[PDB]
Amino acid sequence: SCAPTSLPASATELPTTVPTGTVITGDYTGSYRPQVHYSPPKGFMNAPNGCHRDRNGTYHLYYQYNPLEYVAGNQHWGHATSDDLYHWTNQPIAIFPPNSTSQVFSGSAVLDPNNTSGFFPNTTDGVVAVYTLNTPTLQVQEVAYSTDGGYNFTPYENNPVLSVGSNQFRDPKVFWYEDHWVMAVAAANDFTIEIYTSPNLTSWTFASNFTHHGLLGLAYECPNLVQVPFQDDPSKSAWLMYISINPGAPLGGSVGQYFPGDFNGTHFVAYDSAARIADFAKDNYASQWFADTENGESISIAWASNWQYTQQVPTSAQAFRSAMSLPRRNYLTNITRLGWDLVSLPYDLSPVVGPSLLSSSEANSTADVDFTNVTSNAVWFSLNVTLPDAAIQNASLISADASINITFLPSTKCSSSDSPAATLTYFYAGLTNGALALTRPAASSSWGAENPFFTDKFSYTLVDPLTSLVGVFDRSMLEVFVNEGAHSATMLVFPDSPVGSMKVATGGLPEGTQVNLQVNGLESTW
Amino acid sequence: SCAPTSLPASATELPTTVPTGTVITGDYTGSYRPQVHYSPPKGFMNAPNGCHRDRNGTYHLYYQYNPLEYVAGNQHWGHATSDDLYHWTNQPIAIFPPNSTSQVFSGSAVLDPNNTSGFFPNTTDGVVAVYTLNTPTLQVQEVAYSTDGGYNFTPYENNPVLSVGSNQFRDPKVFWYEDHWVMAVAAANDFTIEIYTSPNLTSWTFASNFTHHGLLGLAYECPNLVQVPFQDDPSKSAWLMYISINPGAPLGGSVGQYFPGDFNGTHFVAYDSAARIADFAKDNYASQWFADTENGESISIAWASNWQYTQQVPTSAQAFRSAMSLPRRNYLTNITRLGWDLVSLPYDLSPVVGPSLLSSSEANSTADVDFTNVTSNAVWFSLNVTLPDAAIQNASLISADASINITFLPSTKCSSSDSPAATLTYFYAGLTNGALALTRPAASSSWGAENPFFTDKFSYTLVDPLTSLVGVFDRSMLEVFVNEGAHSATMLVFPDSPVGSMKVATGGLPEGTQVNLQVNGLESTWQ
Ligand SMILES: *[C@@H]1O[C@H](CO)[C@@H](O[C@@H]2O[C@H](CO)[C@@H](O[C@@H]3O[C@H](CO[C@H]4O[C@H](CO)[C@@H](O)[C@H](O[C@H]5O[C@H](CO)[C@@H](O)[C@H](O)[C@@H]5O)[C@@H]4O)[C@@H](O)[C@H](O)[C@@H]3O)[C@H](O)[C@H]2NC(C)=O)[C@H](O)[C@H]1NC(C)=O
Ligand SMILES: *[C@@H]1O[C@H](CO)[C@@H](O[C@@H]2O[C@H](CO)[C@@H](O[C@@H]3O[C@H](CO)[C@@H](O)[C@H](O[C@H]4O[C@H](CO)[C@@H](O)[C@H](O)[C@@H]4O)[C@@H]3O)[C@H](O)[C@H]2NC(C)=O)[C@H](O)[C@H]1NC(C)=O
Ligand SMILES: OC[C@H]1O[C@H](OC[C@H]2O[C@H](O[C@]3(CO)O[C@H](CO)[C@@H](O)[C@@H]3O)[C@H](O)[C@@H](O)[C@@H]2O)[C@H](O)[C@@H](O)[C@H]1O
Ligand SMILES: OC[C@H]1O[C@H](OC[C@H]2O[C@H](O[C@]3(CO)O[C@H](CO)[C@@H](O)[C@@H]3O)[C@H](O)[C@@H](O)[C@@H]2O)[C@H](O)[C@@H](O)[C@H]1O
Ligand SMILES: *[C@@H]1O[C@H](CO)[C@@H](O[C@@H]2O[C@H](CO)[C@@H](O)[C@H](O)[C@H]2NC(C)=O)[C@H](O)[C@H]1NC(C)=O
Ligand SMILES: *[C@@H]1O[C@H](CO)[C@@H](O[C@@H]2O[C@H](CO)[C@@H](O)[C@H](O)[C@H]2NC(C)=O)[C@H](O)[C@H]1NC(C)=O
Ligand SMILES: *[C@@H]1O[C@H](CO)[C@@H](O)[C@H](O)[C@H]1NC(C)=O
Ligand SMILES: *[C@@H]1O[C@H](CO)[C@@H](O)[C@H](O)[C@H]1NC(C)=O
Ligand SMILES: *[C@@H]1O[C@H](CO)[C@@H](O)[C@H](O)[C@H]1NC(C)=O
Ligand SMILES: *[C@@H]1O[C@H](CO)[C@@H](O)[C@H](O)[C@H]1NC(C)=O
Ligand SMILES: *[C@@H]1O[C@H](CO)[C@@H](O)[C@H](O)[C@H]1NC(C)=O
Ligand SMILES: *[C@@H]1O[C@H](CO)[C@@H](O)[C@H](O)[C@H]1NC(C)=O
Ligand SMILES: *[C@@H]1O[C@H](CO)[C@@H](O)[C@H](O)[C@H]1NC(C)=O
Ligand SMILES: *[C@@H]1O[C@H](CO)[C@@H](O)[C@H](O)[C@H]1NC(C)=O
Ligand SMILES: *[C@@H]1O[C@H](CO)[C@@H](O)[C@H](O)[C@H]1NC(C)=O
Ligand SMILES: *[C@@H]1O[C@H](CO)[C@@H](O)[C@H](O)[C@H]1NC(C)=O
Ligand SMILES: *[C@@H]1O[C@H](CO)[C@@H](O)[C@H](O)[C@H]1NC(C)=O
Ligand SMILES: *[C@@H]1O[C@H](CO)[C@@H](O)[C@H](O)[C@H]1NC(C)=O
Ligand SMILES: *[C@@H]1O[C@H](CO)[C@@H](O)[C@H](O)[C@H]1NC(C)=O
Ligand SMILES: *[C@@H]1O[C@H](CO)[C@@H](O)[C@H](O)[C@H]1NC(C)=O
Ligand SMILES: *[C@@H]1O[C@H](CO)[C@@H](O)[C@H](O)[C@H]1NC(C)=O
Ligand SMILES: *[C@H]1O[C@H](CO)[C@@H](O)[C@H](O)[C@@H]1O
Ligand SMILES: *[C@H]1O[C@H](CO)[C@@H](O)[C@H](O)[C@@H]1O
Ligand SMILES: *[C@H]1O[C@H](CO)[C@@H](O)[C@H](O)[C@@H]1O
Ligand SMILES: *[C@H]1O[C@H](CO)[C@@H](O)[C@H](O)[C@@H]1O
Ligand SMILES: *[C@H]1O[C@H](CO)[C@@H](O)[C@H](O)[C@@H]1O
Ligand SMILES: *[C@H]1O[C@H](CO)[C@@H](O)[C@H](O)[C@@H]1O
Ligand SMILES: *[C@H]1O[C@H](CO)[C@@H](O)[C@H](O)[C@@H]1O
């Protein structure tokens, strides 16, 4: 009746030697184990790597993987595949360190259909991985190739392909621009993204530096240079430099930021000197965009944790630490006053959407949704609010108490007290007009209350009224999307008791305000 | 006796009409009332305004003041004076709105000793206030002058002195540059600081725009363009554009940010495109630098609150809402890797420093300091940690458990739950190496736990090891300064029970590590 809080030792015990060419079996039943998010069968996972789509339409996810412990280290590339970015199949480890004292750090993977590399005389489905090898004294860029569709990789003969004599030089993102390969790589502790060019992915020539932009934190990491379409006009696009920083994010630890601008194949130039943060909570880092997607599609995935507590979260008794974000569709838009904005929406959820739990059109009411019978313990919800045009043209018509309150409440059935696991509060007017508060109350979680970095409360302030809100709760994760993904937050929750229900309350809304609420159970992908 | 948690209605009841030419009496005895920070006798206070030092060395603090309510509105300039920025004397209201439908928003004040303005034919001690007047439809810059040393102000005859036909155009900061006046003013919702020039403070000419720099939030506010000396070399200085943003700070609501650069009298040019945040917590906003200070002394003060909860904090039963930060001495330094850094240190605390409560040289120990006998309920502490040169040249010598833990604990004597009111945790090594955590636990405060914006936990990560930590606790406020003020945080606390003691624990420190801990009670400045 209740998901296990602890698993048998056979499920959690890690091997003392790394398995080659065999899939690692995982038990995906833990009470904190997400059912629609990727997480590794066992061990520690961080940043996504080598994200690309085959011509056969299979999505390849690789990731920083420690197969020997529940903390960072011994980095290999784990591998999982999906046709829909929700139903994941675990694959054997894809990239190994040469020995016990070296590590495979982050990188990217590209299709080389025209065999510019020379690794692929007999296939048009060749994959090239470009990644950082970490030694005690250096970080260098290395190349590996795969003829079997990205499952098994062979080291390049003349590795390494790029060194600057530094041990802070990592996370290469390779892509095709017109007539050559581009590499974005971080000179991490110099707050510089170095852009290199190559015709064959093995011989790299310096092109330009992008330095000391936006928030510095303590290091630039996981650079992504991508073309992102406009939300309102698919035919228009702009280039985006996305940079992860860790430590030293404003909320503490790790965070991503972005710069809209122009790229001409050698040089990126930001449109302005403004700093812009992607997510208004703490648990979204090291976004990578999928290479070789179908026309127009900006698809990204991120690691749904924070370096300040990722190695301490109480999920190791359930055979894992860390999960990816929902896969995201990305756009650029202009929002009122602020201008440039990175839009993030969940990638098509239809394959995991189960039956309706509640449909309601009631304004100024409270809706109670029990989902103790939803075995996934995962729900999707949508809330649309349409203010009368009177209230839109004159905001002072709105009463000070006009609000939306969403609370996730502990199960009575599966228990061990009454604190919500998660809250969302939005005010249309009053003293905190446009303020959205997202909380994981300290009282709900013994582990959370004690961890000195596990921040309880997050906020974003809208200029425009809240018109749309989409949410996914998945056992130990809440993701929310506001105003068609204009604003986005990823938040981990570790409540003592599993979530059994949610309450959605609207109050003090102007006469003629329309409210539409839909809640659906999600189907487990494991 | 224990400090009262509620005051008599005569102490908290506000008048229905604004008093002119009379000092408003305050009761400064409340359990949350700071004893070494400025707060208004009663009513609601926000941003500091018109901050300047007169030639006789008196510091003038003005502030955004609602004399009629415990929330924002009806803005006047309140006034207080000090010789030392700790012993404050309340003064009558200094600037009034012309009528019931207008408000006096933020601004600055300058000495005009050479009478460039023409207001001062018979004095060299003339003060000029330049401030935003808010009407329902416009924000315009106005001038007022004072011949009595900044206590009573007269409107300029030909007000306003600057309009752009906007209702989002405010917070002028005026200063002398070589041979002319400069005004920095915010085109708030366009994320632009407009720089204007004037020979007489009444006629303003556009010079330049500084636009879309750093964090945008929802508005640019309270610009300050100041020359800040180098911490290591007083003969060197650089210009700093300091901008407040609200709402839309990363931690929510309000925060300040800065840009080191060059100013040539017309144009400010940032040295780089980097964004830099001043304070790593939530309760420091609208910093203003004092005009006409001695030498190159950079002196600032800020409002110690956050717009997300400032109007809801549970201090109105004690006749006030909001307090200023400690006054601060400012410098520029280079810190390892990050480079440019705004240094913030408490302005000379010696006039409020009372007797020693503890001096200890013990490493790897826990010191318990009771201060239930300190009537101010305010303490200063200094913690110096010197790692051996061995640990400096090879960091892997430091054990994963090498840490500093400071907890402020509720009084047993003045009880209204055992949770600390505030914590500071620093790790030298391990999985979160260099991470400093500052917390106001939800369990300590019923009001705090319920407020959806009152964040419990804040952090900054050092590259260099922590060598110095200075702290001031003052009833409802904690300020911490790290590595000679390289990093700074201001945090409000509203514990159910007043703080009675602090514990300082060091642990796991390398052999030969020196620790020096000093704790002193502070003397109340309110007589
Ligand atoms: C494109 O950008 C790249 C990346 O910025 C440029 O390459 C860098 O060039 C700069 C000079 O402009 C180099 O910086 C110098 O480094 C010297 C050596 O310092 C190192 O060695 C020291 C002693 O062993 C060591 O203490 C130091 O570490 C410390 O400083 C770090 C500074 O960030 C700090 O993070 C650490 O915590 C630590 O305290 C260094 O490892 C130094 O003597 C000079 O004063 C100067 O700082 C960088 O090393 C280069 N970086 C890389 C990786 O290439 C390149 O020039 C640009 N190219 C073009 C064409 O524009
Ligand atoms: C120095 O900086 C100030 C402050 O930025 C600047 O004044 C501003 O100028 C801008 C641009 O003219 C003004 O913006 C306009 O505002 C009106 C509404 O009153 C809008 O209708 C205009 O919209 C157009 O541009 C939009 C851009 O998003 C488009 O969406 C739209 O389709 C229109 O084409 C436009 O936004 C702004 O109001 C003023 N602000 C103030 C406070 O005066 C000044 O011009 C700069 N001076 C110099 C010399 O550079
Ligand atoms: O080199 C010493 C350091 O190595 C490991 O941490 C490395 C690096 O990991 C993180 O960076 C990213 C992004 O999160 O993660 C992969 C590696 O897993 C990198 O390619 C990528 O930039 C952190 O963000 C960095 O702070 C850190 O330097 C090891 O696990 C550490 O314990 C440490 O010893
Ligand atoms: O103008 C309409 C606006 O008036 C009031 O809010 C004004 C303004 O107050 C704050 O700005 C600063 C800095 O905090 O405070 C003073 C005013 O006391 C300004 O000179 C300065 O920029 C807030 O930060 C702003 O967001 C706010 O606009 C009133 O309280 C509002 O409801 C509104 O009517
Ligand atoms: C957001 O707005 C900016 C400014 O209005 C847009 O940049 C403009 O792009 C149009 C064509 O789409 C040009 O005609 C203008 O000259 C540009 N303005 C400036 C000053 O650069 C930008 O395209 C918009 N972005 C999105 C995502 O809609
Ligand atoms: C921090 O370091 C920077 C970089 O060295 C210093 O900037 C230089 O300052 C010197 C003298 O002031 C100039 O001669 C150089 O041309 C400057 N270089 C750059 C790139 O700006 C800066 O002075 C230092 N700041 C502090 C506070 O020490
Ligand atoms: C491990 O591999 C790295 C990278 O090739 C190499 O530099 C190092 O010498 C190897 N270690 C040993 C002990 O062979
Ligand atoms: C890549 O091309 C460059 C010059 O075009 C050349 O130096 C290098 O040998 C090439 N590498 C391969 C493996 O073809
Ligand atoms: C791209 O533009 C930069 C200047 O912004 C220029 O120096 C560089 O050569 C350009 N590259 C190409 C290939 O046009
Ligand atoms: C908006 O309605 C308020 C009353 O709630 C009124 O005082 C104000 O003048 C109106 N403004 C406009 C733009 O109609
Ligand atoms: C909601 O309640 C408010 C206050 O009671 C009322 O004025 C308003 O008409 C109601 N709104 C709707 C949409 O029912
Ligand atoms: C809200 O409107 C959007 C428009 O795209 C629609 O997709 C969604 O079904 C609506 N949500 C609800 C709860 O009706
Ligand atoms: C209030 O005074 C301001 C500034 O002098 C003026 O613009 C406005 O007309 C006055 N309003 C009323 C209602 O008298
Ligand atoms: C006053 O005049 C003196 C020289 O006579 C000049 O040095 C100083 O800068 C002037 N001060 C102001 C504030 O105008
Ligand atoms: C001018 O100043 C002196 C000294 O302050 C004073 O005695 C005299 O009366 C003043 N005259 C005027 C016009 O104020
Ligand atoms: C200030 O000086 C300007 C230019 O010299 C002039 O236009 C203006 O009338 C002066 N104002 C006063 C009050 O002297
Ligand atoms: C100040 O610098 C700007 C550009 O940085 C220049 O256009 C302007 O003429 C300069 N003004 C003076 C007073 O030198
Ligand atoms: C602690 O170190 C500071 C410098 O950071 C020094 O000035 C101060 O005297 C030291 N404190 C004590 C009590 O020695
Ligand atoms: C640093 O100390 C470690 C042990 O803590 C030792 O193994 C290593 O050899 C030392 N390296 C240097 C810098 O001497
Ligand atoms: C301080 O508390 C932290 C947080 O739990 C702990 O990890 C550390 O070992 C403690 N050290 C001391 C000085 O008590
Ligand atoms: C502090 O204690 C640690 C172990 O907890 C010990 O290794 C070290 O020698 C001690 N250092 C000092 C300075 O007493
Ligand atoms: C997880 O927690 C449950 C109680 O909720 C225990 O039964 C189990 O042993 C594990 O501690
Ligand atoms: C996985 O965790 C279980 C329970 O803590 C252990 O039995 C096992 O040794 C491994 O640590
Ligand atoms: C502060 O607590 C005191 C108890 O001493 C009460 O008098 C007052 O109501 C407030 O709660
Ligand atoms: C202030 O008001 C409080 C009300 O809670 C009293 O309890 C207290 O004694 C004082 O009158
Ligand atoms: C000032 O606050 C006190 C205590 O809450 C009240 O007695 C008075 O009416 C006013 O609210
Ligand atoms: C404020 O209003 C009070 C009554 O509420 C009067 O007594 C007073 O004169 C002033 O008008
Ligand atoms: C002092 O002036 C103020 C504002 O003009 C008034 O509140 C009061 O009536 C007296 O005239």
Author numbering:
A (entry chain B): 142 to 557, 563 to 672
B (entry chain A): 142 to 557, 563 to 673
Which text from the study accompanies this structure?
Rhodotorula dairenensis β-fructofuranosidase is a highly glycosylated enzyme with broad substrate specificity that catalyzes the synthesis of 6-kestose and a mixture of the three series of fructooligosaccharides (FOS), fructosylating a variety of carbohydrates and other molecules as alditols. RdINV subunit is composed of two domains, similar to the rest of the reported fungal β-fructofuranosidases within GH32. The β-propeller catalytic domain contains residues 185 to 487 and is constituted by five blades (I-V), each involving four antiparallel β-strands (ABCD) with a “W” topology. The β-sandwich domain, extending from residue 495 to 673, is composed of twelve β-sheets ordered in two six-stranded clusters of antiparallel β-strands.
To analyze its hydrolytic activity, the inactivated D188A-RdINVΔ21–139 mutant was deglycosylated, crystallized and used for soaking experiments with different sugars, including fructose, sucrose, 1-kestose, raffinose or nystose, and, also, ternary complexes with fructose and palatinose, trehalose or hydroxytyrosol have also been pursued. However, only complexes of this truncated variant with fructose, sucrose or raffinose were obtained, the crystals belonging to the P21 space group with two complete dimers within the asymmetric unit that are essentially similar. To obtain the D188A-RdINVΔ21–139 raffinose complex, a crystal grown in 20% PEG 3350, 0.2 M NaCl, 0.1 M Bis-Tris pH 5.5 (2:1 rate) was transferred for 2 h to a soaking solution containing mother liquor supplemented with 30 mM raffinose. Diffraction data of D188A-RdINVΔ21–139 in complex with fructose, sucrose and raffinose were collected at the ALBA synchrotron station (Barcelona, Spain), being indexed in the P21 space group with four molecules in the asymmetric unit, at 1.86 Å, 2.38 Å and 2.27 Å, respectively. On the other hand, the sucrose and the raffinose complexes are essentially identical in the common portion, an issue that may explain that the specific hydrolytic activity observed on this three-saccharide is very similar to that reported on sucrose hydrolysis. Therefore, the description of subsites +1 and +2 will be based on the complex with raffinose. The glucose bound at subsite +1 is tightly fixed by direct hydrogen bonds to the acid/base catalytic Glu362 (through its O2), and to Asn387 (O2 and O3), with additional water-mediated links from both residues to O3. Similarly, O4 is linked to Gln280 and Arg311 through a water molecule that also makes a polar link to the O6 oxygen from galactose located at +2 subsite. This O6 participates in a well-ordered net of water molecules linking the substrate to Asn275, Gln280 and Asn308, with Asn275 being also water-linked to the galactose O4 and O5 atoms.
